[PDB]
Amino acid sequence: AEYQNFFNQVQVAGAPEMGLKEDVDTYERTPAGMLSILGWMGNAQIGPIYLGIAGTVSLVFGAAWFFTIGVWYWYQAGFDPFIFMRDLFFFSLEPPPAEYGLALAPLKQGGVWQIASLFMAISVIAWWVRVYTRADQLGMGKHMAWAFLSAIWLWSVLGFWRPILMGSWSVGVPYGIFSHLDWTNQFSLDHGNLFYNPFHGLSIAALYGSALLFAMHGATILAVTRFGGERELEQIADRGTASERAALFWRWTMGFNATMEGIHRWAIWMAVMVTLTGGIGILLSGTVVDNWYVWAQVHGYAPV
Amino acid sequence: MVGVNFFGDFDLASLAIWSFWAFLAYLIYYLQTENMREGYPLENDDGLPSANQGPFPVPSPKTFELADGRKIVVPSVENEEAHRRTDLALERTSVNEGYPFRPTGNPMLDGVGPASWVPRRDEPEVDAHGHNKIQPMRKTEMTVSAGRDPRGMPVQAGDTEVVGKIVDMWVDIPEQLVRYLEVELNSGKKKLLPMTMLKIWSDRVRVNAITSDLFDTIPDIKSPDVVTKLEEDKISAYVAGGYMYAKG
Amino acid sequence: MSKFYKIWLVFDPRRVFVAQGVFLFLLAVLIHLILLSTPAFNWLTVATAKHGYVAA
Amino acid sequence: MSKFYKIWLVFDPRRVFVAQGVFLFLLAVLIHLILLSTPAFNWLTVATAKHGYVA
Amino acid sequence: MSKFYKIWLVFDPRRVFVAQGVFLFLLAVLIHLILLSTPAFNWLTVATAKHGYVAA
Amino acid sequence: MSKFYKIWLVFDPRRVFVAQGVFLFLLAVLIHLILLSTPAFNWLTVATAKHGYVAA
Amino acid sequence: MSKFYKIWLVFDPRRVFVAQGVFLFLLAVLIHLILLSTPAFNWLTVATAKHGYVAA
Amino acid sequence: MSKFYKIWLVFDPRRVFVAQGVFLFLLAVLIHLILLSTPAFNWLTVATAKHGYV
Amino acid sequence: MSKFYKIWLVFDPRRVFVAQGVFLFLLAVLIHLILLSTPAFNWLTVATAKHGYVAA
Amino acid sequence: DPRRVFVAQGVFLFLLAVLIHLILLSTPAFNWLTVATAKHGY
Amino acid sequence: MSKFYKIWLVFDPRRVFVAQGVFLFLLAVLIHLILLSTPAFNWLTVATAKHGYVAA
Amino acid sequence: MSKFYKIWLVFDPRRVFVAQGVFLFLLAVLIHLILLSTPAFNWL
Amino acid sequence: ALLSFERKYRVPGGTLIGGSLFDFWVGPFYVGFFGVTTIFFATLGFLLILWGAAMQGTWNPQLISIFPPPVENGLNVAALDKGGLWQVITVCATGAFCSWALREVEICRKLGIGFHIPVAFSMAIFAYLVLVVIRPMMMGSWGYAFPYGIWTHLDWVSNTGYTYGNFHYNPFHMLGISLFFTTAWALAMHGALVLSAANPVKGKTMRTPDHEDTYFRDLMGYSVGTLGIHRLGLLLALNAVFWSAMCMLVSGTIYFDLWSDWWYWWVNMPFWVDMAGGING
Amino acid sequence: LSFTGLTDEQAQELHAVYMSGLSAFIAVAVLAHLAVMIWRPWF
Amino acid sequence: LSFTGLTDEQAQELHAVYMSGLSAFIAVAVLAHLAVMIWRPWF
Amino acid sequence: DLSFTGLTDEQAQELHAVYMSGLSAFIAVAVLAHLAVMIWRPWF
Amino acid sequence: LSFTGLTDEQAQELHAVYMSGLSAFIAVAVLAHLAVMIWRPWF
Amino acid sequence: LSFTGLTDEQAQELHAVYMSGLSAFIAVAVLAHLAVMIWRPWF
Amino acid sequence: LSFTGLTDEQAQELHAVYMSGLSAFIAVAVLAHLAVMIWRPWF
Amino acid sequence: FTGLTDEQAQELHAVYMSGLSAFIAVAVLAHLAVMIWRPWF
Amino acid sequence: DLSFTGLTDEQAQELHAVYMSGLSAFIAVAVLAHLAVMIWRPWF
Amino acid sequence: DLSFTGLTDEQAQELHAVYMSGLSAFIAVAVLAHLAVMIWRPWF
Amino acid sequence: ELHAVYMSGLSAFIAVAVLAHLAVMIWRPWF
Amino acid sequence: SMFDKPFDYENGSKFAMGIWIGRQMAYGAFLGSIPFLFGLGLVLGSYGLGLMLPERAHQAPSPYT
Ligand SMILES: CC[C@H]1c2cc3[nH]c4c(c3C)C(=O)[C@H](C(=O)OC)c4c3nc(cc4[nH]c(cc(n2)[C@@H]1C)c(C(C)=O)c4C)[C@@H](C)[C@@H]3CCC(=O)OC/C=C(\C)CCC[C@H](C)CCC[C@H](C)CCCC(C)C
Ligand SMILES: COC(C)(C)C/C=C/C(C)=C/C=C/C(C)=C/C=C/C(C)=C/C=C/C=C(C)/C=C/C=C(\C)CC/C=C(\C)CCC=C(C)C
Ligand SMILES: COC(C)(C)C/C=C/C(C)=C/C=C/C(C)=C/C=C/C(C)=C/C=C/C=C(C)/C=C/C=C(\C)CC/C=C(\C)CCC=C(C)C
């Protein structure tokens, strides 16, 4: 067996790289350390991390959301440390019942869920501007922010947009480990087998395609690491034999291939289709279609 | 909006699913054209441009401007001609299309097949600050943090014959990664061996890609402390071509 | 009213006319489909009642 | 209105003809399918009742 | 009240007009749908009652 | 009227004939499919009732 | 109170206006939507009770 | 009409006859399978009824 | 109680102001929403009880 | 952490204050809005 | 039929024979399997009933 | 009939015989497996 | 039709079986011995699916379904009309998958690249074999494998999953889902990051990989690197499929009750099981 | 302007035959609608 | 004001044709709405 | 740039003449096909 | 300032056309609300 | 002193027009609240 | 003219054989359809 | 830590307290009005 | 280039003769097989 | 003369003659195997 | 001194916090 | 390869050539036994491995109605 280039044979480290000073206020970066255990598969350097106000706002409101759920668990546990650890996966911060609609429910009957959801909404949005701003100050494109927006689309549909259109917060996702799994299963049951939602099927094709594509692309690059294929940016500007052998493997296998830059357009679009189509399918569930299996039978692709 | 049909059974979910197919059909067209910026137009075995070019058209040119102000345009004739090999030592094994081309001579030295190298720009790869991306360890201040240090280890070739010793390591400064091992052969010349085609044992470095007799013909670097993108392509292609052309 | 021609000095006519055409067609389909939803303005439904077609 | 011929100086004729051809075909299929979906204007069901084709 | 023209020295006209256009269109669609969702101001159902359309 | 031949100065005959051939075949299959889906115009269903073949 | 113009020496005017623009719009929508929620202040369901439109 | 031979100046014969061969076979199989799907025109089913093959 | 001005030599003015803005707006919304929830201090519910508007 | 410890400690003060104030609202005994409603007949 | 030998001036015999061989084996297997799927032409089950072996 | 020897001028005998062995062995397996679907000829 | 650089790579050699007998290209496609067998198996499997549609009586592609033999059939070779056609298509599918992987090995050898792609694809083949061969045989019958239909094999997933209550509580299922979600997340970020550097803001030169490291260190405080992300993306996809295959391998073979009841070993530990309060009292 | 590279006179030649085809297409479409209106009017 | 590169004279003829085309679109739209008002008014 | 395909005006006239012959033959068979179906099973 | 590359004279001329178009948009919107106010007042 | 590349003079112009726009925004808001208070007081 | 490299004479020789094979293929297909029409008509 | 000299920070604190005091005054005036309208004590 | 394969007319003529002999033998056996099946178990 | 495989016409004849001798032996054994099955358990 | 500033400001916050706790007691006490 | 040796056509007896053909065909038959044995090993091995399961493995409800 030859070297499969899954782990580095030798680790070499010098002074930690503090980053590029394009427009970043470099005094807002932490120190940088070196962690050897991470250097076998990737970089050994940990940090420096930029802390501006977007990240600080996101961190404090994310912590507040995390602790708001946590304190509710202590209330559910009777403030008993043993009961808290026994039932940690069974605790749930449920949304208000359906009788309150979109109003502000009492604290004990879903009001905390509304407080926690508000903190989460702030934290996610404060993190999105961090994703946008970090790319802007380095002179890079905003592809990460747009890809993140696709994940936010599904997340906002689940927690905000669909409860608004359904007319009550009760349909929102509970904040718990097993409970939000039970919510997922119950969502499929009371909408008639979410398998027959076409956009759920499209979402799964994208999710399966994402793992197929990353296995294809990850293995393709490792195959051509003999010729510096992992230096994709330099291969885009100056095409080498790594880019050609990678293109010719897939042309001779599938009949068509990508380029170094273009394979990452397949990668980003396959991945954002997971949550773009997923958000649409959840929005249609209940609001437009209440029984996907019956809807299927009407439209073919389900036996009568 | 449940049970509201524009016509027949075509409700809002039907409109969304059909709208998606139109978007997906266009997205595939967009993705396919964006992947036709390299290797086009197609050619025949005789070298002439091909009659068939496929249902998708070649996209409009786009410009990548490098840190040195090069303004690479893809797709473009000049970019394709820059990376085009000339005077290839290949002959057609049959008049029919779709058949392999037989190397006429030594494929390792002529750079054909798995030993093919691309005419990349004859300049070192450069990081953001302008310095050489790949430099020898002696040129920098780095230490072997973990793993097996290969300095001084014998180099055993594929034919189980010792060809030299490792005298230096060439590291990727921005990525903190070892790319090449500089081997000093018995003749005194120094060659670069890509780390991706070596195996560092507890007491030696083994190179199974090529045999002992092929170590003296590994392509050289003009500058002792500078490796060039073109030289990296030649060295990598030469060693990787060994798996097919070393002994048989 | 005598300087509106300078919009093309800001936006590419190729970019505008493609986006505008997609807009006008999507809007036209939206309005036609809204009418088809409402049985009072579904002209196929109205014609069926007026001319005594079957509409099984 | 005599100057409309200058559209071809802005948009490539080959891309316009293909895009227009795709649009016209999909529009025609959409309208034919709308008529087929409504039994009143479905010309196959109308002929079935007129000629007693059973179906 | 005549210094408003200085906004273009800090705002890209190409980005403002696109942002304004999407904002103005989405705002109009929201208001039209809101009126459409209220039966009192839904102009299609109001016309149905006034003119006696079947509205099956 | 007699100037349509210039279409070939714009579109590659190899590309047009292939796309036209694929379109014509797929369109023909679509129309044959619609007729087969309609029991009144499904000629195999019509024949098995006229000649009393199987009817099962 | 005559030295409040120094804010633009600290904050980026491009970012402040965008942040202020979204904040003013989102706040205005939120207040309008709360008013629509309350039947006492829903101006649409005040005219329908005043002039008499649907009452349903 | 008599100038149809010029199609070979536009279409590569090797490309066409591969495409034509795949087309004719897949069409021929499809039509046979459609008939086999219908019991009225399934010639195997017709034979069992005729000869009492059970 | 007059040496507090030294704090601006340490913290970045941009991040302190943005932190002030978010904290103040969040607290203001929180206090208003608590009042809206309580019918005793819901100024709209008080107004409709005082003025007899809809009460629905 | 001359400019960093202050932010974290302020959050701890803010989180605790917003916590206990709302808990007192949950318990009707410690709800000041409730007692004001009874006195003035709101 | 006297000029059919010109086929071999267009298609190389090596690829045609390989394609022809796979097609014939594929077609033969398909037809044998179709008969085996039909119990009345499944020669193994027909032989079982004629002689009497297991009948299960 | 007597001219079939020219098949070896088209296909390399060294390579064809290996392909024949794959085909002939798998055909014998295919027929044995087909027999098992019928208990009457189910030898085992 | 060749790419502008493909000619110097089209050289003889790299085949495993047949030498130069099949060492040629048909258009873009490389044909080998395994190119020939892939075409045979793929075409036979496709034609038998169409034949199964003909026996089923429907020609709607979304309603076509080839079902495995009944559970009472055991491991026997079934009659072709009674689920034996599914078995033939399963062999054709496995023959097509395995010869496709072996064809990629020949292409890897001709291009002189590593064999990561065929090995990564073998994991996908393994999960397929778990669902149609390994798990159904461990449960004793071909009738537990999934059917060959676009929407009927989703009914198999639903019926198989609800046999053990809510299948979300399968611990290997949780690990497989987490890796599948992580793989899609890392694929989005890898695609976005490379396109961010290759397509910078207008007026900026193309970004260096130093920018890519700087961006994610600024954002997250860590960066795997260009080599690390491709290693990690490959490992995430392979582990996601592997631990998914484990979740099915233990469901119905080692575990038989509801998966939600399994998690009560943590609750029923005899030092906090009796304590009142909480969810489990 | 002149993004496509056609001269002004080539645009006139191209537009002259485009409108003839468009005139032919609409002429058939109007006759098609007139026939449908007589056979099964939708107004 | 040269984001696109038009010479302030191509724009005038670009806009002259656009408004001529826009005028034709509005006139048909108004004629269509007048027809629907007579057929069945929505006011 | 109105010579995208590179054909001459003479070649286009020759190519179009053959194409219209094929188009006419295709329509004529289609008209005969519809006339036959209209007699066999009219749809109007 | 000058974050966009426009000049003092370029920006002022751009703003004049923007306000003229904005004035037309307001004028139609005001007329539309007057028509709705007559037909179906919301006050 | 400029944290964002604005001169002191530029900050004078920017703040002056900003307060001009803010003054108009409050003035319309004050009138709007006055009208709603007269139309339907919330106190 | 000759996108495939064939000459006018070669294309005629190609087409003569192709039409010879096509006519034989159609002739058998007509006989097969006639046989099925006699055995089991579909009209 | 900020990069502002003492003189430049002198007006920075003065303007902030100038704006903070105005904010407090409006809040104080608002609470006085609410006490008159709907007292909570 | 009507000699895509590189064969001459003489080589193609003798290759076609051998191919048509193999086809003829193949068709002859298939006809005999179909006659045997038709007698044993007719499908018409 | 054609020799896609580098065998002379003489060498192809010798190899084919040996191959056909083995092919005849292989079929004869297979016929004997079928006669054993036909005697023991006929399939017709 | 940085710490000298913090202690004086922090003590004033605690001073009013104590004064507010006793303000509750005189208005509504719990102990 | 080890088992796919070429043959000396100009210097070789008929029996040596006849044996060489058999060796080539046997090697091909051996290659064809690789997927057959692997598939047989999968089916029988998995079935054998299932015979040592808790015995509720062979009585799971059918996933088909
Ligand atoms: C295309 C769709 C896919 C996708 C894409 C995607 N996700 C993304 C992105 C993209 C492109 C980002 O750029 C963004 C990112 O930053 O990635 C690194 C992100 C992201 N996706 C994430 C998660 C995520 N993505 C998921 C899914 C997906 N993401 C899809 C598969 C999921 C799933 C499957 O559930 C998850 C869980 C994050 C890693 C990140 C966004 C993080 C974020 O918004 O965080 C805000 C901050 C917080 C919530 C704070 C959390 C604090 C902790 C709970 C600890 C608190 C206490 C502790 C003691 C600390 C101290 C606190 C105080 C006392 C100081
Ligand atoms: C849920 O809670 C409820 C809603 C119930 C109660 C809560 C209410 C709350 C929290 C209310 C909060 C309200 C606040 C904070 C309101 C603040 C409003 C402000 C500050 C508005 C400011 C507006 C300023 C405007 C509109 C300025 C406009 C300026 C212009 C139009 C001029 C353009 C600017 C130019 C040209 C600058 C460029 C110049 C140069 C030289 C570059
Ligand atoms: C759902 O709808 C259904 C399927 C039910 C109904 C729909 C049916 C449809 C749409 C059917 C469409 C049918 C069509 C389009 C059929 C077309 C058939 C054609 C064009 C057949 C042509 C056959 C031509 C043949 C077989 C030619 C053979 C030639 C030879 C045998 C000679 C070989 C010579 C060659 C190849 C080249 C000669 C070379 C030299 C150098 C002379």
Author numbering:
A (entry chain M): 2 to 305
B (entry chain H): 1 to 248
C (entry chain O), E (entry chain Q), F (entry chain I), G (entry chain S), I (entry chain V), K (entry chain D): 1 to 56
D (entry chain K): 1 to 55
H (entry chain F): 1 to 54
J (entry chain Y): 12 to 53
L (entry chain A): 1 to 44
M (entry chain L): 2 to 282
What does the paper say about this structure?
Rhodobacter (Rba.) capsulatus has been a favored model for studies of all aspects of bacterial photosynthesis. This purple phototroph contains PufX, a polypeptide crucial for dimerization of the light-harvesting 1–reaction center (LH1–RC) complex, but lacks protein-U, a U-shaped polypeptide in the LH1–RC of its close relative Rba. sphaeroides. The photosynthetic gene cluster in Rhodobacter species contains a unique gene, pufX, which encodes the polypeptide PufX present in the light-harvesting 1–reaction center (LH1–RC) core complex. To further investigate structural and functional roles of protein-U and PufX, we have determined the structure of the native Rba. capsulatus LH1–RC complex. Although this is generally true for the structurally more conserved RCs, our work has demonstrated that structural differences in the RC-surrounding LH1 complex between these two closely related species are significant and that a broad diversity is possible in the structure of this important component of the photosynthetic apparatus.
The LH1–RC purified from Rba. capsulatus wild-type strain NBRC16435T using two-step solubilization followed by DEAE chromatography exhibited an absorption maximum (Qy) at 882 nm for LH1, and the cryo-EM structure of the core complex was determined at 2.62 Å resolution. The Rba. capsulatus monomeric LH1–RC forms a crescent-shaped structure with LH1 containing 10 αβ-subunits distributed on one side of the RC with the other side of the RC completely exposed to the membrane region. Surprisingly, and differing from all wild-type LH1s with known structures (obtained from ~10 species), we have found that the current Rba. capsulatus LH1 structure in an RC-associated form contains only 10 αβ-subunits, making it the smallest LH1 complex reported by far. PufX is located at one edge of the Rba. capsulatus LH1 crescent and interacts with one pair of αβ-polypeptides and the RC-L subunit. PufX in the Rba. capsulatus LH1–RC has a “turn-up” conformation in its N-terminal region (Ser2–Asn12) that self-associates with its own transmembrane domain (Trp21–Tyr28) and interacts with nearby LH1 α- and β-polypeptides. The self-associated conformation of the N-terminus of Rba. capsulatus PufX prevents it from interacting with proteins in another complex, which may explain in part the inability of this species to form a dimeric LH1–RC. Twenty-five bacteriochlorophylls (BChl) a, eighteen spheroidenes, two bacteriopheophytins, four ubiquinones (UQ-10) and one nonheme Fe were identified in the Rba. capsulatus LH1–RC. In addition to the BChls a assigned to either LH1 or RC, an isolated BChl a was identified from our cryo-EM density map in the inner space between LH1 and RC on the cytoplasmic side. This BChl a is surrounded by two LH1 α-polypeptides, the RC H-subunit, a phospholipid and a detergent molecule, and is coordinated from the back by a putative myristate at its central Mg.
